[PDB]
Design a protein around this nucleic acid. Sequence first.
RNA 1: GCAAAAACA
Lengths: 621, 237, 647
Amino acid sequence: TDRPDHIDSRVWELSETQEDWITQVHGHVRRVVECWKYTICCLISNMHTHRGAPQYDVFKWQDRSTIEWICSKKKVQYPERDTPDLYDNERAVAYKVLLVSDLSDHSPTSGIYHDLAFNLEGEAEESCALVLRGSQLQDIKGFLCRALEWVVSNNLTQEVVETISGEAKLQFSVGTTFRTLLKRDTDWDVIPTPRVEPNVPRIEGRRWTQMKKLPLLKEKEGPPSPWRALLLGADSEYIVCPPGTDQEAISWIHSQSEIECIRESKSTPASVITCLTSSLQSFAEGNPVRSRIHEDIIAFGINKKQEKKQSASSSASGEWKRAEYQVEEMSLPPWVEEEMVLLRSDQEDNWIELEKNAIYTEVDGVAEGLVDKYIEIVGRTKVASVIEKWQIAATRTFSQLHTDRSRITACPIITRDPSGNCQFWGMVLLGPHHVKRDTDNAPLLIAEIMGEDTEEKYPKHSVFSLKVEEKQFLLSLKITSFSRNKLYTFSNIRRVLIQPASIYSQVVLSRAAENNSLNLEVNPEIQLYLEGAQRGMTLYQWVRMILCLEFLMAIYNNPQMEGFLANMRRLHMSRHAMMERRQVFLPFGSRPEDKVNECIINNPIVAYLAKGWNSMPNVYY
Amino acid sequence: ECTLRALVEEYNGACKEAPKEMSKQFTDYNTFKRYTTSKKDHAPQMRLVYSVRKPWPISMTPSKEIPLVFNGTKLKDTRTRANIVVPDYWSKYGSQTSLEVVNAILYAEDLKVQRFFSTEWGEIRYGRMLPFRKPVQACPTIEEVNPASIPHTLLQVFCPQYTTLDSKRKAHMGAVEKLKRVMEPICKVQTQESAVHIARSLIDSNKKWLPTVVDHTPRTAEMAHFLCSKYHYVHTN
Amino acid sequence: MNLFTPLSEINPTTTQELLYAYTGPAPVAYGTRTRAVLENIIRPYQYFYKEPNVQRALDIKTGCKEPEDINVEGPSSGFHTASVLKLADNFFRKYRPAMEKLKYWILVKLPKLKYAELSKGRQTYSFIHKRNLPAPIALEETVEFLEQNLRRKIGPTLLSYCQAIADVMELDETTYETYTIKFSREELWDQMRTLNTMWKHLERGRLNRRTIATPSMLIRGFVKIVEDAAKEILENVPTSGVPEKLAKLASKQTFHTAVTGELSGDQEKFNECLDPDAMRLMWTVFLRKLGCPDWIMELFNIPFMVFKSKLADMGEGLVYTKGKLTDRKPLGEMPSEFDDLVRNVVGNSISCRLGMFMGMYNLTSTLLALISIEREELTGSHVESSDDFIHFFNCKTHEEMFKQAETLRLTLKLVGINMSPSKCILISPAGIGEFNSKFHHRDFVGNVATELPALVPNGTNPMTDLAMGLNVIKHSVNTGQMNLCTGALAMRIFNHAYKYAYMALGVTRRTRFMEENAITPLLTNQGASPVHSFSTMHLDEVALRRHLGLLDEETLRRILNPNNPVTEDYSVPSCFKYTLSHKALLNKEERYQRVTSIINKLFPEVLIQEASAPGTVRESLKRRLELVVERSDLDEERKKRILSRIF
RNA sequence: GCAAAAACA
């Protein structure tokens, strides 16, 4: 409660923190008793001196660092859990103020310090009389009396006696009103004591069946999925340019290019070619950022939301209903196999230029040899060049959208072959991109050099005819939006190399373990199910196709892809179990293929993986 | 003394400008030690490219040893903010320190380099070998120190005056004198938090889950990332 | 998919790490969470009876049901009380050392827990500013509110904080206090009950997005107490998924003719079929057989009873479309598929006694599952982490194994766990399985990461970024997720990204400045050749360069000088370890920063241990400053002059 | 247009 009358303020706010009174059984009474002890300590010291310095040091409720300093002087040392309350310079001894019930049953607590005892009605132990002065004893009398009157008046005699006898006891209390609030939404008390005999009932269950044959995934029906990635992929080409800087290459392209529309798409109108030509002209002049032209409204969707809202408001009819969304079901397109076969085609250069790490030990040499050989086998491939293009384009787009501009930024996609020549894959144009959150979409107008045009594969792309010098090239424009998170993720697209490298390294190290000798020239034969038959292919091209699949999965990642993979892990495990002549058993209502089929809706590579699974044997002997 | 006067003036400033904060319990320091208004960034690596390329990326304490403009390049904003090339300038035209300070700062890190280069490597053996992970002491220490006594050992080295008898008692003696001798040039008001960090790592016996083909000594545990794997084992003499 | 399934020299288990989307972007949860939250809330009310009856399940307080009510052909919400009692008793009897450690933690370590550890928690909804706030700010405002309403100072221990919460819950009126925020017992109760929901971001492997709930700061102390006790138990039981355990079971050779099987599966709707009262009963049984006092029981039972009264926020509203228009409307305004729950709407929150939410009691749910495991028929090795489990059966007969698996399913159903039939697969000969992203094949357990290492600098500063990148790659190597070639390739990719992020590649302003001023590149972040090899991932950059002669003593003294204007992460301090970069909160933050700055200078020991030292900051600083002046071996006159100015 | 059970423009 509040401060007792006899205890003065200073001791009260000194004792407020010394101990956790609220968690003690009699914390208020315990605090009052400790305040009594501190007041007795202060009365014993008072205004007394020995050799010009105070005779007593009141260690109780004093800073521990100060106590240790004072003990460093005088050459004493006291543990913190048995620290005496007082130290007397006259006798060079330390005292502890103690309260007891009777003075007859008193013994020295310990040899470190002497005991000052009081029985709570004023009188003291004979040792206290032999030590303390008459005035000090009278003051202790006059405090313990008129503290006892407060004890009796509030009827705390038993609580005080309990506090004196034992030490502090921990507790935690919940009162009536909080208890009633707690009991509102349950059928039991605060401590649940249901009146039921413990028992485990016998419940009839269903029967466990066997998955004799592997599940057959569902192939969806509908229009084939168009290409819906940020960039072109396997159909990506570059224009060889004379050696120089990016500005020189862009000027060379812009000065000797004629552009005519071949195929026009309603999604990307042919009028947005003006934006790309203006960006090329500005970049050739040294300005990667240009002002806004009229076609930039359509190209980057400026003020599109505030027009669609008015269109919807004008076209308002009927009553409100819960918005049921739907995802169009699409079938496996023919272009996925073409993309896979084209991504593995060989290239002249290496396209993977990573600085080598240091080499100090033989383990480092082995690791760097493995990495070098993996780069050799997956470098001179089209998929590596496409990964490089994706990396450069995403990095340059990401690095230019933090500014929050109102103008159009141009980010050319240019590589260098090991001869100095500039390779122009295309350019990405960034709109105003007033981006608030990391998931916000930045408007883009991507131009890429196209190997071949397919309206079925690219319905939303506008394909233009591009002629430089005497060569013919195809240029594709697509209006697109793409978030900060996804652009940052694809700027680190080189991490797709890890998993094929993991597989290659595991195969090589397995061979090394078998023969107890590292050989980086191993190109073993890997048996696989191909066109529904068991033939084999070499390690190198198998790793190439794995890298192609991983790149396609990475650029086509979405909730369907991740759900499909997470639910095909179980079926892949089951298939591997059935290869080892193991039996697979399922609970009641177990349809593992349903978890996968829920995820096959319109993803081209999910469908490609599903068809690859379906062409495999479903029963093993 | 200047140090005492500086401490007093800052203390009076805290009492005046932040009275309510000074009226809090001293144990509350464990709470407002990390009292930050800024929300946690789930993707801090995603801002590095922009942050490095901003004008004046680096925040610096005001000083005169760095020119405002160095060969047509403005180094500081004239707290004050520094150009990204300021650490590059300091690596060539900066103020030097004593060799003893360098040795103490590189201590517990120079030791790891010496241990790597003072050991000889056997031939790599490739085979079907199963790395099973157990918790072992990751890094060798100057003295073997029981955990939960590491903080008490640190108190004796750094602030032996601000400690109790029991904390003094439950402290590894022998490791205090080694730590005191090697940390002496950097046990000052500045780099006190750094010197504690090197002091911890010198006697920290934390256990980590590491691949094992044979039982790792503390020497081989810090190198378990290349000593063993699923397909190879390296013998250390 | 056939390309991912080899038939020679390598098995599909190793290549099953290819069925991942490491490089692709993680899915983003857009827009309202109201539909997902309402679905999560309504699932327990549809699974309480075999034939769905939401209206009859909405007036159930304690999710207790008869054994005949349990649905074996579908999901079942609720628990059987006698089953819970017997299972908890069996769990207590078998794992006796774990409960002895629980008793020691309760008696010794529980009273010493400090409520400042609540500041280390994640984001918390503030009942004063009515907004989401960082954990330190919420803790500070809650403690100040408690002190204002209780006329006393809250002790540093967690028990003192919980006692303060219990005491303030008993006041008719509470205030905050210049704006005066006025509460009531019912309003403060509602804030205590309320769960703040949000999308679970950056989650992989799911077609549908999930939501998670956060407790109020008024209940997080009790939640931390119960979760710490649950962790103390789970760290000492062999059926918990915490150490290893999967590898131990994989390497355990059973017999030569025994019928040994391996069951791998997930739990369907794990948090949507759990009732807090079952955990209350389990905890009460544990404490009662431990001999704990009644106040321990009350302390452990408060959290789950508050959860039984939860007021989970139902997002921003349900999406409605007239034509092409889109509107966001609360539940109950117009008909929807959640019209049964309209009667439970309290403001923008909805009350729901049954079911739980993900991210609230992860360890107590695991404990409930593990006590469900404890039977006489289930003589098999079980390991489980929340909703993911693996079970090993060592039987002598296939029918015996099948009966044990069915008994496992039913005994999980007794408390409402309901493993997913389509996600649980049992292999008749043991030796192939999966559990918690570890893939087991014969005498090999392969840890496959759910997320590939970022291979990008963390964004603090070049030395720390290099240190943590190398440490992440080294940890990936240690877990087995990476090997020699993979580790070195990751190092090279990280090195390229690290150099690019710090203007060390091509021609930039930094490289131009270094070239014009003849500043040779001596560090990796400066464009120098990388000094780290695969075997030297654990070595610092400043070292290993002095040793190899790439850094001379002059530049070492120049960059390691502590007086530089710019200044586990085992990176030595250097000039390259720099730093790049709510009305009444910023000023309070800067005042607290100044108060922190005066400490760590007068108190060297707070850098080693906690603050302790009972008392307030003012007089503690006062007396420490007095002591340091008095023990400064200076003249008496100077000491007196200095102390005369200390006020 | 990007996206996928609803946001960005």
